[PDB]
Design a protein around this ligand. Structure first.
Ligand SMILES: CCCCCCCC
Ligand SMILES: CCCCCCCC
Ligand SMILES: CCCCCC
Ligand SMILES: CCCCCC
Ligand SMILES: [Ca+2]
Ligand SMILES: [Ca+2]
Ligand SMILES: [Ca+2]
Ligand SMILES: [Ca+2]
Ligand SMILES: [Ca+2]
Ligand SMILES: [Ca+2]
Ligand SMILES: [Ca+2]
Ligand SMILES: [Zn+2]
Length: 469
């Protein structure tokens, strides 16, 4: 496979929406999913009141063991220090993406969102079967609003120890989701009390796209390696931003995700190959980097909005929220595929045999060690006046892949190398400056005397060995 083949495959990963079918099910766009997850139309600002900020209180009440909650469960207790710590991180992860402010109040004071443990389904009888539940805003029962109550079965080790059992942390984020107005992404009516993924309303109702789902990411071809996302995923972000608006103040500086992170978020950071990230990135400004340098697996990194990446040996585990521009990416020691976007991108392959694709804008490309391939598929990739730079080219080892053009022209003789331009479309010209150690690659794609494509290359290039055409 060419570099271009790999780029094309990553660009078309998890295509969705526009009426297509997947797994015999309707595919929804990110937007459609956000709307469907919020189909009850309930918010803390009112029924069908969307897009407005909200300020909410939360607490950890000191529930009495023999008391019975509204759902009939008993053996109640207050959240432990560990549970409180993890719940606050879950709250923060929702506040990061939408215009929600959370303020803690005292255990005995009325609060919008509450957290409690229960252990028994009836007095003296421990429940080992259930996990957790919560009430959406404006859930009126016997005259009282149950909205905001969240309840967890502390007999489950993950609920008791969410700091070391990542399904517990996910459960906290999920149930807070309900408390804010999110539903499961389907009702699963056809499953009649024993539902499976086969009963979804839309194909992207899986844990790849939403932590409001209970269906494995494997149903959509994801693979999270036995781990569970801590924080809102791509379609959860669409949902909650529909409800309370997008948080334009979040991470507006130059932000590094992954290794060497300055996010101050556990779920956006790692300090070792064994620590695997799973996240959907929301970022409201600045020059940002996906630093996945410390992973040894073969990775695929796509910097386009709404797109999925294969990071740290997982599949479809990293994504970028709608409306977000991430500028830079750093691969690991594996053989990576790294795809930029229309902005200026710094792309670094690291060790391994990498494929780099800057796309539009003026990109800076570093293959690193290994046999790397730099791919181009439009004159606008590297326009004169905004040229890409390949900073580390090694002749006989690295390659420039222009193969898209002859494939599109269906002619082996469209791109070809000449010693001087004649105005004929397809002509490519190399010019080497031994004094500056810079090679210019100029191509006349559009058919003018002046070329419309110019790549600047640090290093010599050997035309006999270094191209894929
Ligand atoms: C056809 C997509 C529907 C998403 C909006 C929610 C409909 C209840
Ligand atoms: C047990 C009745 C509580 C109200 C239920 C409505 C939320 C599903
Ligand atoms: C099983 C109890 C769930 C209550 C919220 C729907
Ligand atoms: C309440 C819906 C849960 C679905 C898990 C099978
Ligand atoms: Ca940023
Ligand atoms: Ca940015
Ligand atoms: Ca690499
Ligand atoms: Ca680019
Ligand atoms: Ca490399
Ligand atoms: Ca290299
Ligand atoms: Ca470019
Ligand atoms: Zn739920």
């Amino acid at each position: 496979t060419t570099g271009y083949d790999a780029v094309d495959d990553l660009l078309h990963y998890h295509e969705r929406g526009n009426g297509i079918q997947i797994n015999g099910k309707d595919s929804f766009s990110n937007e459609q999913a956000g709307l469907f997850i919020t189909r009850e139309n309930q918010t803390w600002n009112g029924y069908k009141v969307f897009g407005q900020p909200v300020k909410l209180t939360f607490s950890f009440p000191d529930y009495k063991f023999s008391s019975t909650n509204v759902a009939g469960d008993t053996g109640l207790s207050k959240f432990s220090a560990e549970q409180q710590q993890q719940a606050k991180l879950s709250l923060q992860s929702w506040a990061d993406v939408a215009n929600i402010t959370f303020t803690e109040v005292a255990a005995g004071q009325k609060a919008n969102i509450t957290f409690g443990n229960y252990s028994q389904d009836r007095p003296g009888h421990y429940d080992y079967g259930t996990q957790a539940y919560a009430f959406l805003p404006n859930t009126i029962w016997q005259g009282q609003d149950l909205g905001g109550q969240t309840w967890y079965n502390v007999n489950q080790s993950n609920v008791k120890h969410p700091a070391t059992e990542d399904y517990g942390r996910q459960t906290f984020t999920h149930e807070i989701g309900h408390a804010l107005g999110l539903s499961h992404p389907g009702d699963y009516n056809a499953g009649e009390g024993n539902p499976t993924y086969n009963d979804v309303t839309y194909a992207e109702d899986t844990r790849q796209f939403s932590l409001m789902s209970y269906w494995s990411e494997t149903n959509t071809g994801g693979d999270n390696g036995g781990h569970y996302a801590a924080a809102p995923l791509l379609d959860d972000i669409a949902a909650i931003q529909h409800l309370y608006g997008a948080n334009l103040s979040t991470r507006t500086g130059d932000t590094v995700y992954g290794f060497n992170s300055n996010t101050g978020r556990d779920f956006l950071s790692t300090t070792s190959n064994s620590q695997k990230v799973i996240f959907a990135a929301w970022d409201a400004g600045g020059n940002d980097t996906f630093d996945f340098s410390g992973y040894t697996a073969n990775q695929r990194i796509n910097l386009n909005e709404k797109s999925f990446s294969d990071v740290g040996g997982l599949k479809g585990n990293v994504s970028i929220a709608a409306g977000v521009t991430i500028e830079n990416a750093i691969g690991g020691s594996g053989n990576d595929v790294i795809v930029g976007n229309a902005a200026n991108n710094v792309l670094k392959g690291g060790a391994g045999n990498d494929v780099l694709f800057g796309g539009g804008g003026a990109d800076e490309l570093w293959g690193g060690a290994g046999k790397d391939i730099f791919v181009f598929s439009a004159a606008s990739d590297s326009a004169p006046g905004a040229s890409d730079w390949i900073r580390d080219f090694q002749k006989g080892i690295d390659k420039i892949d222009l193969s898209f053009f002859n494939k599109e022209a269906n002619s082996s003789d469209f791109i070809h190398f000449v010693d001087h331009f004649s105005g004929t479309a397809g002509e490519a010209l190399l010019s080497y400056n031994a004094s500056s150690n810079v090679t210019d690659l100029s191509v006349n794609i559009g058919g003018h005397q002046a070329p419309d494509f110019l790549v600047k290359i640090v290093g010599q290039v050997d035309v006999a060995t270094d191209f894929i055409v």
